[PDB]
């Protein structure tokens, strides 16, 4: 094999060598970096690439693939199930190759806090700051950027259902209205986990159920379709 960036800006196989006349970059997911430089394909995916230019403190060469297990990244948005609370940190699940960990403090409280507000089998909305190849990942719930609070332990009642990443992505694409498109219907509360997790909760079971089911199919539809399909729901 022999390739470089554009040589294949498409789909590749696990076990390939390719590179560009470079110096430094951040190895993505299904690619390996060793050779001046070079790269290897490990998993099986198409080629993806986001450019940093220079100012943009973010630039990598990516290889994605619609595979089962979810892979946490930077401060990613995921939904959780709490596997267990052992000491100051508890592991919640995210469907990674293992769990992650949350502090006895990520809810803006000093001890004697979030006690009954943290429980096995529970749900959580969290962005984990730490997920790096050789280390295990851990997540938070505060808004450290300003220590505000954008992520709480999920709702009073509700629903969570898996979702094809392909969809989660497309469902979360800023240039996709579904999100605002959904901004419609009232009164509703839903959460969107990278890890493919939608926690919903509408008036009754029903509108709620529909909505989810509607979601389960969301993907293949007139870029418009959902629209009424939604304003259909919206209306009742």
């Amino acid at each position: 094999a022999r390739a470089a960036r554009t040589v294949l800006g498409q789909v590749v196989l696990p076990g390939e060598e390719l590179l560009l006349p470079e110096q430094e970059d951040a190895e993505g997911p299904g690619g390996a970096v060793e050779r001046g430089d070079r790269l290897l394909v490990t998993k099986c995916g198409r080629l993806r690439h986001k450019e940093p230019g220079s100012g943009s403190g973010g630039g990598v060469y990516w290889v994605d693939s619609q595979q089962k297990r979810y892979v946490p990244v930077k401060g990613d948005h995921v939904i959780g199930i709490v596997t267990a609370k052992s000491g100051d940190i508890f592991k919640v699940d995210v469907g990674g190759s293992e769990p992650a960990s949350l502090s006895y403090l990520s809810f803006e409280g000093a001890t004697k806090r979030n006690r009954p507000n943290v429980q096995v089998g529970d749900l959580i909305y969290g962005q984990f700051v730490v997920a790096n190849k050789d280390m295990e990942p851990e997540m938070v719930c505060i808004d450290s950027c300003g220590r505000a609070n954008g992520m709480g332990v999920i709702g009073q009642d509700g629903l969570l259902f898996k979702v094809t990443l392909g969809l989660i992505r497309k469902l979360l694409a800023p240039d996709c209205e579904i999100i605002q498109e959904v901004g419609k219907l009232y009164p509703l509360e839903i959460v969107f986990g990278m890890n493919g997790r939608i926690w919903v909760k509408a008036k009754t079971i029903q509108q709620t159920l529909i909505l989810a089911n509607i979601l389960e199919a969301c993907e293949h539809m007139t870029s418009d379709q959902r629209k009424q399909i939604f304003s259909r729901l919206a209306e009742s």
């Binding site: 110096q23 430094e24 190895e27 970096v33 060793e34 050779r35 001046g36 430089d37 940190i89 960990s101 730490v130 790096n132 050789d134 280390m135 295990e136 851990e138």
Partner: protein, 180 residues
């Protein structure tokens, strides 16, 4: 110059034994089995013992220096494998069962475990107090010469430390953080 755990030499009237010790009613029987050794005391009498081929015995000292290679990394807690409590020790019994915390990962700064010593590398540190309440030992990397010493790249290179908090490989270019 040999003994079997069933022969006797002296008795409570001359010496006591640390090695190969077996005593009943005052005489000297040899517990151990393998070789015979005698002792001279600063008291005008000798101590008796059998010979422990394993002259190397547990000696990891409380606040002592050690050679170790990291294990698992928690951006909050750090784990390690220690082999040499200096060098005389080759012991692998305590194998790698030791822990250190950021606060003691240095004396100043505030750089996370993640940016100090990774999973695969060998590190050097002195020992802190030990509370065998969980079978763990505490150690520090708060020294101008202390810290970690091993460097491996993404390609498979070795790294030199470009600074107090960095190591790097010449092949590819990795500006990485490791407590030098």
């Amino acid at each position: 110059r040999y003994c079997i755990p069933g022969e006797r030499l002296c008795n409570l009237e001359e010496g006591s034994p640390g090695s190969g010790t077996y005593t009943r009613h005052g005489y000297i029987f040899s517990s151990l089995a393998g070789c015979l050794m005698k002792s001279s005391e600063n008291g005008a009498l000798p101590v008796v013992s059998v010979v422990r081929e394993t002259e190397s015995q547990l000696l990891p000292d409380v606040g002592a220096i050690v050679t170790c290679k990291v294990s698992s990394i928690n951006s909050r807690f750090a784990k390690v494998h220690i082999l040499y409590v200096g060098s005389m020790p080759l012991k692998n019994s305590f194998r790698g069962t030791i822990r250190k915390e950021d606060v003691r990962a240095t004396e100043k700064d505030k750089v996370e475990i993640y940016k100090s010593f990774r999973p695969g590398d060998i590190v050097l540190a002195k020992v802190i107090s030990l509370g065998d309440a969980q079978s763990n030992y505490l150690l520090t990397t708060a020294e101008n010469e202390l810290g970690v010493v091993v460097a491996h790249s993404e390609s498979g290179i070795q790294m030199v430390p470009i600074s107090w908090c960095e190591m790097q490989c010449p092949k590819t270019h990795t500006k990485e953080f490791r407590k030098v």
